[PDB]
Symmetry: C5
Subunit: 334 residues, 5 copies
């Protein structure tokens, strides 16, 4: 019997190998299969990957005439001792079990053990949307032992930076993924001790042109369209008056639609400043003609008892101010 060549009943597998002595080293390899989703409101991402472990245990040695290793499944895991890695700062995770548990075990004749499993994990990631939609985000995934400190278990990447592999077809619907690399660091708990921690890092970016076309183009078009009133005859009140209020209504509807399209992040972003500055420009364009009309009526009544200079100066002042605002805005936000 396979479980009789291995002396399962003769050893206490509730304790780590080398109990009471130096720490046992464990090597780790990771292969990333896919990135499933990302949430901007809850600030988390989902990943599916393969996790592998490497260690040696003399209690699992068996006599053999050659180097043929045996293979087992998740049923033997509950009997032998195995590491207890967990994902730090994770929200939820599970191990796939169809059509059975995705667990394998390979034992060398001298006692070397390979332990692999397939897992999906959701982890948190703090994001800053102040520079939206020109922002860039960085995320990380962390692995650590739960029960054993550095004095009992030593955790490291088995092959350095070569221990990380990624699928050729990994992609996201609305982000660009790049710059995968791994690092290590020591963690401290005030009541427990010191622990080793591993990291996997990557970066995300957006598509700029889509957001530009969807947001900045209509606002600029409406602002430029509001300047048309400066060239219409001032005597045509029933034509000059409705144009401004209709432009205001159009801008308000555009802003409402843009707000409805974006995720519910409740603080000021870069796009809001541009939109509301455009709204203020459209607002001032309406008061200009009211002032002009009042002055014309007062002059006519006084006379009773040619282009106005305000239009002539507005035709020059408004585009220059808009260009200056655009220059400052695009110099600040790169």
């Amino acid at each position: 019997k396979s479980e009789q060549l291995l002396r399962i009943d003769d050893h206490d597998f509730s304790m780590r190998p080398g109990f009471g002595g130096p720490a046992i080293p464990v090597g780790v390899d990771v292969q990333v299969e896919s990135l499933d989703s990302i949430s901007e409101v809850d600030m988390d991402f989902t990943m599916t990957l393969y996790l592998r472990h490497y260690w040696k245990d003399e209690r699992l040695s068996f006599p053999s005439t050659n180097n043929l290793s045996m293979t087992f499944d998740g049923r033997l895991v509950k009997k032998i001792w195995v590491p207890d890695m967990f994902f730090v700062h994770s929200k939820r995770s599970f191990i796939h079990d169809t059509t059975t548990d995705n667990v394998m075990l390979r034992v060398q004749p001298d006692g070397k053990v390979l332990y692999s499993l397939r897992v999906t994990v959701t982890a948190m990631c703090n994001m800053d949307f102040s520079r939206f939609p020109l922002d860039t985000q960085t995320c990380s995934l962390e692995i650590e032992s739960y029960a054993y400190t550095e004095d009992d278990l030593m955790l490291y990447w088995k092959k350095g930076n070569d221990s990380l592999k990624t699928d050729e077809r990994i992609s996201l619907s609305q982000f660009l993924i790049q710059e995968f690399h791994t690092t290590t660091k020591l963690a401290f708990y005030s009541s427990t001790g010191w622990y080793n921690r591993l990291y996997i890092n990557f970066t995300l970016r957006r598509h700029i042109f889509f957001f530009l076309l969807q947001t900045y183009f209509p606002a600029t078009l409406m602002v430029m369209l509001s300047w048309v009133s400066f060239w219409i005859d001032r005597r045509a009140v029933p034509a000059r008056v409705p144009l401004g209020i209709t432009t205001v209504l159009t801008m308000s509807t555009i802003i409402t639609g843009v707000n409805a399209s974006m995720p519910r992040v409740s603080y000021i972003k870069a796009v809001d400043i541009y939109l509301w500055v455009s709204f203020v420009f459209v607002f001032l364009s309406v008061l200009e003609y009211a002032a002009v009309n009042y002055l014309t009526t007062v002059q006519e009544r006084k006379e009773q008892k040619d282009t106005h200079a305000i239009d002539k100066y507005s035709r020059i002042i408004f585009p220059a101010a808009y260009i200056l605002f655009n220059l400052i805005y695009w110099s600040i936000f790169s």
Copy 2:
């Protein structure tokens, strides 16, 4: 064997230590890892944390030549006696189990036991939105024993206020978190007895300027824009008439969008009063010109058979009334 140094089979672990005598004291430490989400419609929040227990049991003592403690996992938990803390007023909760159960056990040679586990819990919190968006909310998390009254188990914070730790990077997308502290209180059940309860408290706040810019600015702009009609010549009926109805339409669309953006809380809030008062002002601005036009037509027909005084008085009355309303409103709602 580790489970033979501990006399597992020689003791009845179905009863608490010191059964039939004084209550056994248990100490508790908590470390908060993250706040996951918050719901304003269901009135609850989600938290992930570490929970630790401290107690002594002579039945778990083992002989040793030094102070080296043993370490175990969740498999030994089902055999020995452990406390039964639960979260009061919680909706749902679970213990993480990837890649295995996040449970540890450390036993001192003299019988002192440390028991720790990692858990995510969702708890209810009553909220009042009468002062939205200038409201402030307070939340609490409660811990209590389920089966043992104060005559059998005594629960306390092990190190007073030093028993609570929070992560350095805890944050929320739309709230500001502050003022973490712990308290204690006694609870009474009419059919069961008295129990000790522990509390963890914190406060939440919003970003005022975002809501101000998104809501109060356009309404004030539209109200000020409606006053322009008071300065246009009364003889230009086809210019005076459409302006009011278009302003009414714009205000209605703005109110509809604002209502669609907010969560579905079905009672009156502070913002609604401001919005509907602005709507009423815009409404009255339309009836003013109708009265003026009717009076002018009646006068002209009588004569057949200069600014009107109503406009002159409106130009002064409307802004003063709006300023008085703003002063009263901002004095009441701080």
Copy 3:
């Protein structure tokens, strides 16, 4: 050992106490902790509560020198016999298990047993929205034994109406809860027999003023605003014409927003009648001026080859009809 004082191995716990004889009485107490949510589309509600059982079993008696009772947990439940209550007309439910099963057992020396557990349940409730938003709903929760008929198990409230307790801070975001009381009734199954059933009843109400302000106010304002056209000079066609169509557009947008705000209940409610009657009034106000203008043009052309009487009669007829409709509507719907 505790499980040896109780003769667990000497008795067949697969059969109820007093098997083959009279029915065994069981008492029930309930404490309501919170109401979690309510769905108007799926017609269900969620509740969390404590459930307690009382019965006597001589097979669990143990010798003792005093009245000290023993305490156990969910592990002993799988060995002894326990009642099998279930929730009738429920959709889903579960028992909390963090950090362990929320189950307790207390056994008196003479054999009296107390059995308590904590559970969350979702139950259906038929609702009628014909009188929305002035409707009132009544809901109930039902408890019954699954396997044992009244000839084998007798179920009753232990202390009558005093067996129901409710939390002091139970509340809902959009409803008012009142009138908790309990009743009993007998149930019949054609293929199984008769069963006892228990009931918990309560009532729900809404906030009227919020819905009034959000719906009835703008429609009335628009209807009153449409009457302004009756006082404008009939010769100002470019002013009379756009007002009606703009009012129609505003009313249509308001109705669309109100429909989008309400839940998807696909049959006629009270508010829809009011909204569409207002729409019909606004519609007729437009045809009135078309008739007036056609008559004026015909008269002028005939003459070629002062207020119109229609306006004079409309100024009186329209408000009277609207007031009559309001009186009838508010007399029918209380």
Copy 4:
């Protein structure tokens, strides 16, 4: 002991009764408790019901002096042999387990067995929305044995059509349920053999008047309102021009709202044809006046160098065409 009167250890319950001989007949009864929900996008429905089984097994006979039957629970199910019915074409299902498994067993002294359980199941149903909202749907639920063909197990309704019962208060929020009946049929699998299958059928209908009032009324009102322009003086260009474009805008907003209100079924339905035909009529009403105005201007310029006939003919042609379209449409779609 109850489990010793039944010779559990003396029989191999891994094989069906009468193994190697004729098929064993099994009777089935069903009682429907409620219909929980229905999805028009995923095309499925949810149901909760009671399922009962009837068969005889001599291996479960016990000696008794009378006809008193014994009662058991789900614990005995794992030892004795039971049928293996499953729901064909189902997406997900589960058995209720609060406060324990909803399973009962009753065994007669001669070996007759009754087996009942409570289950919730979600099943698919193909739907056709071409005639929306005047469509009618039919759904079915299927029961079949998984492992045993007709040569080993014979499945039938125990009492014919009397085996189906429905709750008195079953209802849906947006559908009308009627015509419950049962049928039987034989199923064939190319690689396994023949199987018996049972069916439960019902029909669903909608509320016509709600959809009529919400959709067809405003479109007809707008189409009739667009005809007003035919009676206004052609010389009033600033009154004739805006009316058409404002009607077009109103119709577009109504269509957008109606599309937003309906579920996301991505193919043409009956309502879309009506809406777009109305839109085309409103579109043509605008080109009519443009042609009239161009002809009038050309005539005036020629003369420089009374109602137009087009209006006179349009006043007759447009309503007749609309009535003909309505007659054809309502004759085709019943």
Copy 5:
């Protein structure tokens, strides 16, 4: 006993048949039952199917006088050795278990075994929406062994292309399914070795006419309606001015509604180009009349101190440019 004819206790079922020798061949058959849903944001699909396995094991042979095979359930699976197939690139999956596990076993007297189970699986699929709504997508489902390489287990389709069957009533609400076929390929893992993989492929298509009618028709209608202004008298400023701004508002609302209706794919698609080109045309139509009016006013003022040529040329230039754009667009996008 059935489990005593099979020598369960006499064999070590932790190792594959023929351990230490040549690979054991396993045959696979699949029957597709239904396609449940498809997500365009998460890029995945859900499928329900039957999975069957074929292999021979001499350790399960039993003596029999005829060719009668025995039948078992999921309880025997935990004792005998079974293959360990899993779904590659899957997100989540489960095995149905109502009213019991959907697992069957049939063993021939000579040791041939049939193993079948029912499973639902969700798998990822990369999609490209650049040609929306004229895009075409291809999807695949993959099956592979987890623990055994090609040197230990050989996987193949049992009957070639005849091993795949599909239900007669499989359909989707918004897609057309076609072209089911199977393929095979070898997979390599750098740290584990080589594996055999199986594929199931199919194609999806959309309904073109629905999207055409919903999107392209109103934009073309609005563009054609904007050309009407070229035929109105230039002296009617209060009629020429509002038409353009109202058309702009209508186009903006249509674009906002279309964007709200589509799924949140954040990059440029084919429809957006058409919509924004139409918007630009409508925008230029407004500047044309502003230029014409300014020139007319300048000429009149100069004279103080007939159709304009711009209109005559625009009437020809605008439709020709629109037709050229349509030809190029529909030649590029087929």
